[PDB]
Amino acid sequence: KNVVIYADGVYDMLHLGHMKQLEQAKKLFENTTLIVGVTSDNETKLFKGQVVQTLEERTETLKHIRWVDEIISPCPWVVTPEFLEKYKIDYVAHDDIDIYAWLKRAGKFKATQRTVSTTDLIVRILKNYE
Amino acid sequence: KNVVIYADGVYDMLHLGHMKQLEQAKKLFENTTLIVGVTSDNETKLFKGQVVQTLEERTETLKHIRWVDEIISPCPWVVTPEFLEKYKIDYVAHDDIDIYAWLKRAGKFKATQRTVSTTDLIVRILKNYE
């Protein structure tokens, strides 16, 4: 009855937003193993833009989150069927926004949402001054 | 064989520093229940200085950390013997720096260290500009 869930991301400067999302994947089903994939530095740098924390930093933070059962660090940038069988992954967990159609097609796509960011906090610090 | 560990703090804008410290208390012994105490807003405001996140925000973040078993939120500002018996706490976990002598006296004080802060990160963001 144990279901393997894979949720990938950058997880840069993690915050309650990311945590609430990981909790969501973890509790998709009664019995889960949540595998998280952390994207490599150069792949983020190139495909998204700046990454603030190194792989080791972003991965070390993940291991402290109670919902996380296993980390694939680094993880490949785009998920593939090979990757799915290799890790015996049952579902992929991500936010909607379609490069994930083929997963929905296979009933293997479960969608998670967001919310609360670091940036928000500095504003509250600087709001204290004009 | 299960030992109750209490570790209190502000846990404002939690980061790997705080997490590594909580991991430390949790693994003080083979079988632990880590109880964390989150300090009230006005008590922090008054005794330490500014607190950036409300109690509910700081407490909601704690619940995501895998080492944390139980939260007392808010928690009293200074620990007492009453408080210890009431929660059947065996050890108190904190960093050295003596308002905690009476705990050392009773063999009930176990010391944890620090390390990696949010503030550090904004520097790395702004370092990108003169």
PDB file of all heavy atoms in Angstrom, chain A residues 16 19-20 23 52-54 57 60-61 63-68 121-122 124, chain B residues 16 19-20 23 52-54 57 60-61 63-68 121-122 124, unseen atoms left out:
ATOM      1  N   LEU A  16       8.057  28.679   4.249  1.00  0.00           N
ATOM      2  CA  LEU A  16       6.802  27.998   4.552  1.00  0.00           C
ATOM      3  C   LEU A  16       6.042  27.649   3.285  1.00  0.00           C
ATOM      4  O   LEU A  16       5.380  26.607   3.225  1.00  0.00           O
ATOM      5  CB  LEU A  16       5.935  28.855   5.468  1.00  0.00           C
ATOM      6  CG  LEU A  16       4.738  28.135   6.092  1.00  0.00           C
ATOM      7  CD1 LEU A  16       5.144  27.414   7.346  1.00  0.00           C
ATOM      8  CD2 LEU A  16       3.588  29.092   6.379  1.00  0.00           C
ATOM      9  N   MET A  19       7.502  24.403   2.274  1.00  0.00           N
ATOM     10  CA  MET A  19       7.147  23.370   3.232  1.00  0.00           C
ATOM     11  C   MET A  19       5.684  22.969   3.074  1.00  0.00           C
ATOM     12  O   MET A  19       5.380  21.780   2.940  1.00  0.00           O
ATOM     13  CB  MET A  19       7.470  23.841   4.649  1.00  0.00           C
ATOM     14  CG  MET A  19       8.925  24.300   4.804  1.00  0.00           C
ATOM     15  SD  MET A  19       9.281  25.101   6.391  1.00  0.00           S
ATOM     16  CE  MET A  19      10.684  26.127   6.004  1.00  0.00           C
ATOM     17  N   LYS A  20       4.766  23.945   3.031  1.00  0.00           N
ATOM     18  CA  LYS A  20       3.357  23.595   2.872  1.00  0.00           C
ATOM     19  C   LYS A  20       3.150  22.749   1.615  1.00  0.00           C
ATOM     20  O   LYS A  20       2.338  21.814   1.632  1.00  0.00           O
ATOM     21  CB  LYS A  20       2.485  24.860   2.874  1.00  0.00           C
ATOM     22  N   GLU A  23       4.509  19.096   2.425  1.00  0.00           N
ATOM     23  CA  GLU A  23       3.471  18.459   3.227  1.00  0.00           C
ATOM     24  C   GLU A  23       2.353  17.948   2.335  1.00  0.00           C
ATOM     25  O   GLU A  23       1.847  16.835   2.531  1.00  0.00           O
ATOM     26  CB  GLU A  23       2.915  19.455   4.251  1.00  0.00           C
ATOM     27  CG  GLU A  23       2.124  18.840   5.386  1.00  0.00           C
ATOM     28  CD  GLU A  23       1.364  19.891   6.217  1.00  0.00           C
ATOM     29  OE1 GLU A  23       1.293  21.082   5.798  1.00  0.00           O
ATOM     30  OE2 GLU A  23       0.829  19.527   7.295  1.00  0.00           O
ATOM     31  N   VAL A  52      20.410  31.124  -5.492  1.00  0.00           N
ATOM     32  CA  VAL A  52      21.100  31.822  -4.414  1.00  0.00           C
ATOM     33  C   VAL A  52      21.922  30.867  -3.565  1.00  0.00           C
ATOM     34  O   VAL A  52      22.962  31.243  -3.021  1.00  0.00           O
ATOM     35  CB  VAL A  52      20.080  32.580  -3.552  1.00  0.00           C
ATOM     36  CG1 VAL A  52      20.708  32.991  -2.235  1.00  0.00           C
ATOM     37  CG2 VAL A  52      19.555  33.773  -4.292  1.00  0.00           C
ATOM     38  N   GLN A  53      21.463  29.636  -3.409  1.00  0.00           N
ATOM     39  CA  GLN A  53      22.160  28.656  -2.602  1.00  0.00           C
ATOM     40  C   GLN A  53      22.673  27.527  -3.482  1.00  0.00           C
ATOM     41  O   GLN A  53      22.035  27.146  -4.473  1.00  0.00           O
ATOM     42  CB  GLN A  53      21.250  28.103  -1.511  1.00  0.00           C
ATOM     43  CG  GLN A  53      20.786  29.146  -0.521  1.00  0.00           C
ATOM     44  CD  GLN A  53      19.899  28.549   0.567  1.00  0.00           C
ATOM     45  OE1 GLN A  53      18.884  27.908   0.286  1.00  0.00           O
ATOM     46  NE2 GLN A  53      20.290  28.750   1.816  1.00  0.00           N
ATOM     47  N   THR A  54      23.844  27.008  -3.112  1.00  0.00           N
ATOM     48  CA  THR A  54      24.425  25.872  -3.800  1.00  0.00           C
ATOM     49  C   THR A  54      23.559  24.635  -3.594  1.00  0.00           C
ATOM     50  O   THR A  54      22.706  24.576  -2.700  1.00  0.00           O
ATOM     51  CB  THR A  54      25.839  25.591  -3.290  1.00  0.00           C
ATOM     52  OG1 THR A  54      25.773  25.003  -1.983  1.00  0.00           O
ATOM     53  CG2 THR A  54      26.625  26.873  -3.200  1.00  0.00           C
ATOM     54  N   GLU A  57      23.826  23.335  -0.065  1.00  0.00           N
ATOM     55  CA  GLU A  57      23.032  24.126   0.873  1.00  0.00           C
ATOM     56  C   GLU A  57      21.538  23.829   0.741  1.00  0.00           C
ATOM     57  O   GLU A  57      20.847  23.598   1.740  1.00  0.00           O
ATOM     58  CB  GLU A  57      23.282  25.611   0.648  1.00  0.00           C
ATOM     59  CG  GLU A  57      24.657  26.110   1.031  1.00  0.00           C
ATOM     60  CD  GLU A  57      24.918  27.504   0.474  1.00  0.00           C
ATOM     61  OE1 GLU A  57      24.123  27.944  -0.391  1.00  0.00           O
ATOM     62  OE2 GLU A  57      25.904  28.160   0.890  1.00  0.00           O
ATOM     63  N   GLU A  60      20.909  20.313   2.003  1.00  0.00           N
ATOM     64  CA  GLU A  60      21.034  20.107   3.440  1.00  0.00           C
ATOM     65  C   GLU A  60      19.800  20.614   4.170  1.00  0.00           C
ATOM     66  O   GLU A  60      19.391  20.043   5.186  1.00  0.00           O
ATOM     67  CB  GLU A  60      22.298  20.782   3.987  1.00  0.00           C
ATOM     68  CG  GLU A  60      22.416  20.619   5.498  1.00  0.00           C
ATOM     69  CD  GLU A  60      23.683  21.224   6.085  1.00  0.00           C
ATOM     70  OE1 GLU A  60      24.359  22.044   5.410  1.00  0.00           O
ATOM     71  OE2 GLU A  60      23.992  20.866   7.239  1.00  0.00           O
ATOM     72  N   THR A  61      19.197  21.679   3.670  1.00  0.00           N
ATOM     73  CA  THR A  61      17.989  22.191   4.300  1.00  0.00           C
ATOM     74  C   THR A  61      16.827  21.207   4.154  1.00  0.00           C
ATOM     75  O   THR A  61      16.144  20.889   5.137  1.00  0.00           O
ATOM     76  CB  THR A  61      17.647  23.552   3.702  1.00  0.00           C
ATOM     77  OG1 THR A  61      18.829  24.371   3.715  1.00  0.00           O
ATOM     78  CG2 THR A  61      16.553  24.221   4.524  1.00  0.00           C
ATOM     79  N   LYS A  63      16.798  18.061   4.063  1.00  0.00           N
ATOM     80  CA  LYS A  63      16.817  16.891   4.932  1.00  0.00           C
ATOM     81  C   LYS A  63      16.218  17.192   6.302  1.00  0.00           C
ATOM     82  O   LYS A  63      15.873  16.258   7.032  1.00  0.00           O
ATOM     83  CB  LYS A  63      18.239  16.323   5.075  1.00  0.00           C
ATOM     84  CG  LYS A  63      19.004  16.752   6.337  1.00  0.00           C
ATOM     85  CD  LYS A  63      20.144  15.805   6.615  1.00  0.00           C
ATOM     86  CE  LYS A  63      20.989  16.260   7.797  1.00  0.00           C
ATOM     87  NZ  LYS A  63      21.713  17.500   7.434  1.00  0.00           N
ATOM     88  N   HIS A  64      16.055  18.462   6.664  1.00  0.00           N
ATOM     89  CA  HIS A  64      15.489  18.759   7.967  1.00  0.00           C
ATOM     90  C   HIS A  64      13.972  18.754   7.981  1.00  0.00           C
ATOM     91  O   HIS A  64      13.389  18.808   9.073  1.00  0.00           O
ATOM     92  CB  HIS A  64      15.993  20.106   8.466  1.00  0.00           C
ATOM     93  CG  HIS A  64      17.398  20.058   8.932  1.00  0.00           C
ATOM     94  ND1 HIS A  64      18.465  20.008   8.062  1.00  0.00           N
ATOM     95  CD2 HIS A  64      17.919  19.987  10.174  1.00  0.00           C
ATOM     96  CE1 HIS A  64      19.587  19.937   8.752  1.00  0.00           C
ATOM     97  NE2 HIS A  64      19.283  19.916  10.036  1.00  0.00           N
ATOM     98  N   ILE A  65      13.329  18.700   6.808  1.00  0.00           N
ATOM     99  CA  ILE A  65      11.875  18.813   6.703  1.00  0.00           C
ATOM    100  C   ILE A  65      11.256  17.436   6.875  1.00  0.00           C
ATOM    101  O   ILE A  65      11.670  16.466   6.215  1.00  0.00           O
ATOM    102  CB  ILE A  65      11.463  19.437   5.364  1.00  0.00           C
ATOM    103  CG1 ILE A  65      12.173  20.782   5.158  1.00  0.00           C
ATOM    104  CG2 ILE A  65       9.957  19.574   5.308  1.00  0.00           C
ATOM    105  CD1 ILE A  65      12.060  21.721   6.322  1.00  0.00           C
ATOM    106  N   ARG A  66      10.255  17.356   7.770  1.00  0.00           N
ATOM    107  CA  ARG A  66       9.750  16.069   8.240  1.00  0.00           C
ATOM    108  C   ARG A  66       9.009  15.316   7.150  1.00  0.00           C
ATOM    109  O   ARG A  66       8.968  14.082   7.181  1.00  0.00           O
ATOM    110  CB  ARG A  66       8.842  16.257   9.479  1.00  0.00           C
ATOM    111  CG  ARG A  66       7.357  16.201   9.198  1.00  0.00           C
ATOM    112  CD  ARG A  66       6.511  15.948  10.463  1.00  0.00           C
ATOM    113  NE  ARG A  66       6.638  16.972  11.499  1.00  0.00           N
ATOM    114  CZ  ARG A  66       7.120  16.745  12.718  1.00  0.00           C
ATOM    115  NH1 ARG A  66       7.542  15.541  13.081  1.00  0.00           N
ATOM    116  NH2 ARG A  66       7.168  17.745  13.600  1.00  0.00           N
ATOM    117  N   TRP A  67       8.440  16.029   6.185  1.00  0.00           N
ATOM    118  CA  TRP A  67       7.713  15.372   5.114  1.00  0.00           C
ATOM    119  C   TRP A  67       8.630  14.672   4.137  1.00  0.00           C
ATOM    120  O   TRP A  67       8.155  13.828   3.368  1.00  0.00           O
ATOM    121  CB  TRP A  67       6.862  16.390   4.364  1.00  0.00           C
ATOM    122  CG  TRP A  67       6.208  17.332   5.281  1.00  0.00           C
ATOM    123  CD1 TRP A  67       6.370  18.685   5.316  1.00  0.00           C
ATOM    124  CD2 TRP A  67       5.311  17.000   6.354  1.00  0.00           C
ATOM    125  NE1 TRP A  67       5.612  19.217   6.326  1.00  0.00           N
ATOM    126  CE2 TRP A  67       4.944  18.208   6.975  1.00  0.00           C
ATOM    127  CE3 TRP A  67       4.761  15.802   6.830  1.00  0.00           C
ATOM    128  CZ2 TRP A  67       4.054  18.257   8.054  1.00  0.00           C
ATOM    129  CZ3 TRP A  67       3.876  15.852   7.912  1.00  0.00           C
ATOM    130  CH2 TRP A  67       3.534  17.067   8.506  1.00  0.00           C
ATOM    131  N   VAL A  68       9.920  15.007   4.134  1.00  0.00           N
ATOM    132  CA  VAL A  68      10.830  14.520   3.104  1.00  0.00           C
ATOM    133  C   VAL A  68      11.360  13.175   3.542  1.00  0.00           C
ATOM    134  O   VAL A  68      11.880  13.042   4.650  1.00  0.00           O
ATOM    135  CB  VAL A  68      11.979  15.506   2.854  1.00  0.00           C
ATOM    136  CG1 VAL A  68      12.903  14.961   1.784  1.00  0.00           C
ATOM    137  CG2 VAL A  68      11.426  16.835   2.417  1.00  0.00           C
ATOM    138  N   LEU A 121       9.730  39.067   3.915  1.00  0.00           N
ATOM    139  CA  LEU A 121      10.146  39.361   5.281  1.00  0.00           C
ATOM    140  C   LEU A 121      11.028  40.597   5.353  1.00  0.00           C
ATOM    141  O   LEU A 121      10.838  41.436   6.239  1.00  0.00           O
ATOM    142  CB  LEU A 121      10.868  38.156   5.882  1.00  0.00           C
ATOM    143  N   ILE A 122      11.996  40.727   4.441  1.00  0.00           N
ATOM    144  CA  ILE A 122      12.845  41.919   4.421  1.00  0.00           C
ATOM    145  C   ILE A 122      12.001  43.181   4.311  1.00  0.00           C
ATOM    146  O   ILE A 122      12.335  44.227   4.879  1.00  0.00           O
ATOM    147  CB  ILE A 122      13.854  41.837   3.268  1.00  0.00           C
ATOM    148  CG1 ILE A 122      14.676  40.568   3.386  1.00  0.00           C
ATOM    149  CG2 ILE A 122      14.765  43.053   3.290  1.00  0.00           C
ATOM    150  CD1 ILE A 122      15.700  40.640   4.481  1.00  0.00           C
ATOM    151  N   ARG A 124       9.090  43.599   5.639  1.00  0.00           N
ATOM    152  CA  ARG A 124       8.619  43.867   6.990  1.00  0.00           C
ATOM    153  C   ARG A 124       9.736  44.421   7.868  1.00  0.00           C
ATOM    154  O   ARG A 124       9.471  45.220   8.773  1.00  0.00           O
ATOM    155  CB  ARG A 124       8.001  42.597   7.575  1.00  0.00           C
ATOM    156  CG  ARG A 124       7.063  41.913   6.597  1.00  0.00           C
ATOM    157  CD  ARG A 124       5.865  41.297   7.306  1.00  0.00           C
ATOM    158  NE  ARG A 124       6.260  40.300   8.294  1.00  0.00           N
ATOM    159  CZ  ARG A 124       5.433  39.438   8.876  1.00  0.00           C
ATOM    160  NH1 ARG A 124       4.137  39.423   8.601  1.00  0.00           N
ATOM    161  NH2 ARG A 124       5.918  38.566   9.757  1.00  0.00           N
TER     162      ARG A 124
ATOM    163  N   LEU B  16      19.083  27.094   8.724  1.00  0.00           N
ATOM    164  CA  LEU B  16      19.842  25.871   8.969  1.00  0.00           C
ATOM    165  C   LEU B  16      20.519  25.903  10.327  1.00  0.00           C
ATOM    166  O   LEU B  16      20.639  24.864  10.987  1.00  0.00           O
ATOM    167  CB  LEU B  16      20.876  25.653   7.869  1.00  0.00           C
ATOM    168  CG  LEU B  16      21.525  24.268   7.851  1.00  0.00           C
ATOM    169  CD1 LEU B  16      20.677  23.292   7.085  1.00  0.00           C
ATOM    170  CD2 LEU B  16      22.935  24.310   7.277  1.00  0.00           C
ATOM    171  N   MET B  19      17.894  24.673  12.626  1.00  0.00           N
ATOM    172  CA  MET B  19      17.614  23.271  12.368  1.00  0.00           C
ATOM    173  C   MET B  19      18.743  22.391  12.895  1.00  0.00           C
ATOM    174  O   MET B  19      18.491  21.442  13.643  1.00  0.00           O
ATOM    175  CB  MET B  19      17.358  23.056  10.877  1.00  0.00           C
ATOM    176  CG  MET B  19      16.263  23.976  10.326  1.00  0.00           C
ATOM    177  SD  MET B  19      16.105  23.936   8.520  1.00  0.00           S
ATOM    178  CE  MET B  19      15.382  25.522   8.156  1.00  0.00           C
ATOM    179  N   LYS B  20      20.001  22.717  12.563  1.00  0.00           N
ATOM    180  CA  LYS B  20      21.105  21.900  13.057  1.00  0.00           C
ATOM    181  C   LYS B  20      21.069  21.811  14.583  1.00  0.00           C
ATOM    182  O   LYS B  20      21.360  20.744  15.142  1.00  0.00           O
ATOM    183  CB  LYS B  20      22.448  22.439  12.537  1.00  0.00           C
ATOM    184  N   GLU B  23      18.111  19.324  15.539  1.00  0.00           N
ATOM    185  CA  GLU B  23      18.634  17.983  15.306  1.00  0.00           C
ATOM    186  C   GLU B  23      19.504  17.545  16.471  1.00  0.00           C
ATOM    187  O   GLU B  23      19.421  16.397  16.925  1.00  0.00           O
ATOM    188  CB  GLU B  23      19.442  17.954  14.004  1.00  0.00           C
ATOM    189  CG  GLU B  23      19.713  16.575  13.443  1.00  0.00           C
ATOM    190  CD  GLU B  23      20.751  16.591  12.304  1.00  0.00           C
ATOM    191  OE1 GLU B  23      21.408  17.647  12.077  1.00  0.00           O
ATOM    192  OE2 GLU B  23      20.918  15.541  11.633  1.00  0.00           O
ATOM    193  N   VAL B  52      10.564  39.362  14.235  1.00  0.00           N
ATOM    194  CA  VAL B  52      10.130  39.651  12.873  1.00  0.00           C
ATOM    195  C   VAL B  52       8.862  38.894  12.516  1.00  0.00           C
ATOM    196  O   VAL B  52       8.044  39.370  11.727  1.00  0.00           O
ATOM    197  CB  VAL B  52      11.261  39.318  11.888  1.00  0.00           C
ATOM    198  CG1 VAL B  52      10.722  39.247  10.474  1.00  0.00           C
ATOM    199  CG2 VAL B  52      12.361  40.331  11.995  1.00  0.00           C
ATOM    200  N   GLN B  53       8.689  37.699  13.058  1.00  0.00           N
ATOM    201  CA  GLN B  53       7.526  36.888  12.765  1.00  0.00           C
ATOM    202  C   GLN B  53       6.677  36.726  14.017  1.00  0.00           C
ATOM    203  O   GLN B  53       7.196  36.652  15.139  1.00  0.00           O
ATOM    204  CB  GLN B  53       7.936  35.522  12.227  1.00  0.00           C
ATOM    205  CG  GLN B  53       8.689  35.587  10.918  1.00  0.00           C
ATOM    206  CD  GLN B  53       9.059  34.201  10.401  1.00  0.00           C
ATOM    207  OE1 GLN B  53       9.701  33.409  11.094  1.00  0.00           O
ATOM    208  NE2 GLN B  53       8.642  33.902   9.180  1.00  0.00           N
ATOM    209  N   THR B  54       5.361  36.689  13.807  1.00  0.00           N
ATOM    210  CA  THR B  54       4.423  36.457  14.888  1.00  0.00           C
ATOM    211  C   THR B  54       4.601  35.049  15.443  1.00  0.00           C
ATOM    212  O   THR B  54       5.209  34.172  14.818  1.00  0.00           O
ATOM    213  CB  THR B  54       2.982  36.635  14.408  1.00  0.00           C
ATOM    214  OG1 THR B  54       2.604  35.517  13.591  1.00  0.00           O
ATOM    215  CG2 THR B  54       2.858  37.892  13.588  1.00  0.00           C
ATOM    216  N   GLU B  57       3.316  32.446  13.037  1.00  0.00           N
ATOM    217  CA  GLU B  57       4.253  32.201  11.942  1.00  0.00           C
ATOM    218  C   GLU B  57       5.453  31.371  12.398  1.00  0.00           C
ATOM    219  O   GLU B  57       5.828  30.389  11.748  1.00  0.00           O
ATOM    220  CB  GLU B  57       4.734  33.524  11.359  1.00  0.00           C
ATOM    221  CG  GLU B  57       3.697  34.323  10.603  1.00  0.00           C
ATOM    222  CD  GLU B  57       4.171  35.749  10.349  1.00  0.00           C
ATOM    223  OE1 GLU B  57       5.184  36.146  10.973  1.00  0.00           O
ATOM    224  OE2 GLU B  57       3.544  36.471   9.537  1.00  0.00           O
ATOM    225  N   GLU B  60       4.251  27.860  13.156  1.00  0.00           N
ATOM    226  CA  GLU B  60       3.861  27.046  12.013  1.00  0.00           C
ATOM    227  C   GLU B  60       5.084  26.497  11.295  1.00  0.00           C
ATOM    228  O   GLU B  60       5.054  25.382  10.764  1.00  0.00           O
ATOM    229  CB  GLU B  60       2.980  27.844  11.043  1.00  0.00           C
ATOM    230  CG  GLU B  60       2.606  27.021   9.814  1.00  0.00           C
ATOM    231  CD  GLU B  60       1.686  27.748   8.845  1.00  0.00           C
ATOM    232  OE1 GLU B  60       1.548  28.997   8.924  1.00  0.00           O
ATOM    233  OE2 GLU B  60       1.101  27.047   7.995  1.00  0.00           O
ATOM    234  N   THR B  61       6.163  27.260  11.270  1.00  0.00           N
ATOM    235  CA  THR B  61       7.378  26.776  10.631  1.00  0.00           C
ATOM    236  C   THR B  61       7.977  25.596  11.399  1.00  0.00           C
ATOM    237  O   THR B  61       8.307  24.560  10.806  1.00  0.00           O
ATOM    238  CB  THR B  61       8.374  27.925  10.507  1.00  0.00           C
ATOM    239  OG1 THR B  61       7.701  29.058   9.933  1.00  0.00           O
ATOM    240  CG2 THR B  61       9.535  27.512   9.612  1.00  0.00           C
ATOM    241  N   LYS B  63       6.590  23.306  13.053  1.00  0.00           N
ATOM    242  CA  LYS B  63       5.930  22.017  12.892  1.00  0.00           C
ATOM    243  C   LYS B  63       6.416  21.282  11.646  1.00  0.00           C
ATOM    244  O   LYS B  63       6.202  20.072  11.533  1.00  0.00           O
ATOM    245  CB  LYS B  63       4.400  22.169  12.869  1.00  0.00           C
ATOM    246  CG  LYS B  63       3.755  22.203  11.474  1.00  0.00           C
ATOM    247  CD  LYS B  63       2.285  21.880  11.560  1.00  0.00           C
ATOM    248  CE  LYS B  63       1.591  22.008  10.211  1.00  0.00           C
ATOM    249  NZ  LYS B  63       1.562  23.432   9.808  1.00  0.00           N
ATOM    250  N   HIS B  64       7.088  21.965  10.723  1.00  0.00           N
ATOM    251  CA  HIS B  64       7.552  21.276   9.532  1.00  0.00           C
ATOM    252  C   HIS B  64       8.885  20.580   9.720  1.00  0.00           C
ATOM    253  O   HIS B  64       9.282  19.810   8.835  1.00  0.00           O
ATOM    254  CB  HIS B  64       7.652  22.250   8.367  1.00  0.00           C
ATOM    255  CG  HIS B  64       6.331  22.617   7.808  1.00  0.00           C
ATOM    256  ND1 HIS B  64       5.480  23.499   8.439  1.00  0.00           N
ATOM    257  CD2 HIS B  64       5.677  22.180   6.712  1.00  0.00           C
ATOM    258  CE1 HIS B  64       4.368  23.610   7.738  1.00  0.00           C
ATOM    259  NE2 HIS B  64       4.460  22.815   6.688  1.00  0.00           N
ATOM    260  N   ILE B  65       9.581  20.834  10.835  1.00  0.00           N
ATOM    261  CA  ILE B  65      10.929  20.313  11.059  1.00  0.00           C
ATOM    262  C   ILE B  65      10.829  18.929  11.680  1.00  0.00           C
ATOM    263  O   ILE B  65      10.110  18.730  12.676  1.00  0.00           O
ATOM    264  CB  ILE B  65      11.749  21.255  11.947  1.00  0.00           C
ATOM    265  CG1 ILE B  65      11.758  22.673  11.358  1.00  0.00           C
ATOM    266  CG2 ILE B  65      13.146  20.703  12.122  1.00  0.00           C
ATOM    267  CD1 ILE B  65      12.131  22.733   9.907  1.00  0.00           C
ATOM    268  N   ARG B  66      11.558  17.970  11.084  1.00  0.00           N
ATOM    269  CA  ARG B  66      11.360  16.555  11.391  1.00  0.00           C
ATOM    270  C   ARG B  66      11.815  16.209  12.797  1.00  0.00           C
ATOM    271  O   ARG B  66      11.288  15.263  13.393  1.00  0.00           O
ATOM    272  CB  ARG B  66      12.085  15.664  10.354  1.00  0.00           C
ATOM    273  CG  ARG B  66      13.406  15.091  10.816  1.00  0.00           C
ATOM    274  CD  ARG B  66      13.873  13.889   9.969  1.00  0.00           C
ATOM    275  NE  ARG B  66      14.089  14.184   8.554  1.00  0.00           N
ATOM    276  CZ  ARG B  66      13.403  13.625   7.561  1.00  0.00           C
ATOM    277  NH1 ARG B  66      12.438  12.746   7.797  1.00  0.00           N
ATOM    278  NH2 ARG B  66      13.698  13.945   6.300  1.00  0.00           N
ATOM    279  N   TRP B  67      12.765  16.960  13.341  1.00  0.00           N
ATOM    280  CA  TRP B  67      13.248  16.682  14.681  1.00  0.00           C
ATOM    281  C   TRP B  67      12.250  17.068  15.748  1.00  0.00           C
ATOM    282  O   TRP B  67      12.387  16.615  16.890  1.00  0.00           O
ATOM    283  CB  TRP B  67      14.557  17.423  14.925  1.00  0.00           C
ATOM    284  CG  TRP B  67      15.442  17.364  13.754  1.00  0.00           C
ATOM    285  CD1 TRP B  67      15.907  18.418  13.027  1.00  0.00           C
ATOM    286  CD2 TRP B  67      15.943  16.175  13.118  1.00  0.00           C
ATOM    287  NE1 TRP B  67      16.685  17.963  11.995  1.00  0.00           N
ATOM    288  CE2 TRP B  67      16.732  16.591  12.031  1.00  0.00           C
ATOM    289  CE3 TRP B  67      15.823  14.804  13.381  1.00  0.00           C
ATOM    290  CZ2 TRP B  67      17.399  15.684  11.198  1.00  0.00           C
ATOM    291  CZ3 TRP B  67      16.485  13.899  12.545  1.00  0.00           C
ATOM    292  CH2 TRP B  67      17.260  14.345  11.473  1.00  0.00           C
ATOM    293  N   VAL B  68      11.264  17.901  15.415  1.00  0.00           N
ATOM    294  CA  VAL B  68      10.374  18.469  16.422  1.00  0.00           C
ATOM    295  C   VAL B  68       9.241  17.497  16.650  1.00  0.00           C
ATOM    296  O   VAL B  68       8.578  17.080  15.700  1.00  0.00           O
ATOM    297  CB  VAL B  68       9.840  19.842  15.993  1.00  0.00           C
ATOM    298  CG1 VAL B  68       8.918  20.393  17.062  1.00  0.00           C
ATOM    299  CG2 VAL B  68      10.987  20.792  15.776  1.00  0.00           C
ATOM    300  N   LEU B 121      22.355  35.688   3.600  1.00  0.00           N
ATOM    301  CA  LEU B 121      21.944  35.410   2.229  1.00  0.00           C
ATOM    302  C   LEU B 121      21.716  36.686   1.435  1.00  0.00           C
ATOM    303  O   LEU B 121      22.149  36.777   0.282  1.00  0.00           O
ATOM    304  CB  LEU B 121      20.682  34.547   2.223  1.00  0.00           C
ATOM    305  N   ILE B 122      21.040  37.677   2.025  1.00  0.00           N
ATOM    306  CA  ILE B 122      20.834  38.950   1.335  1.00  0.00           C
ATOM    307  C   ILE B 122      22.164  39.555   0.909  1.00  0.00           C
ATOM    308  O   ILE B 122      22.269  40.195  -0.144  1.00  0.00           O
ATOM    309  CB  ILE B 122      20.057  39.923   2.232  1.00  0.00           C
ATOM    310  CG1 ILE B 122      18.742  39.300   2.659  1.00  0.00           C
ATOM    311  CG2 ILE B 122      19.800  41.223   1.487  1.00  0.00           C
ATOM    312  CD1 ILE B 122      17.728  39.269   1.552  1.00  0.00           C
ATOM    313  N   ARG B 124      24.748  37.881  -0.058  1.00  0.00           N
ATOM    314  CA  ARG B 124      25.108  37.191  -1.287  1.00  0.00           C
ATOM    315  C   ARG B 124      24.260  37.667  -2.462  1.00  0.00           C
ATOM    316  O   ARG B 124      24.738  37.684  -3.601  1.00  0.00           O
ATOM    317  CB  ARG B 124      25.002  35.681  -1.073  1.00  0.00           C
ATOM    318  CG  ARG B 124      25.647  35.240   0.228  1.00  0.00           C
ATOM    319  CD  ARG B 124      26.333  33.889   0.085  1.00  0.00           C
ATOM    320  NE  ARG B 124      25.404  32.838  -0.314  1.00  0.00           N
ATOM    321  CZ  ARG B 124      25.668  31.536  -0.274  1.00  0.00           C
ATOM    322  NH1 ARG B 124      26.840  31.076   0.138  1.00  0.00           N
ATOM    323  NH2 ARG B 124      24.729  30.671  -0.655  1.00  0.00           N
TER     324      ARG B 124
END
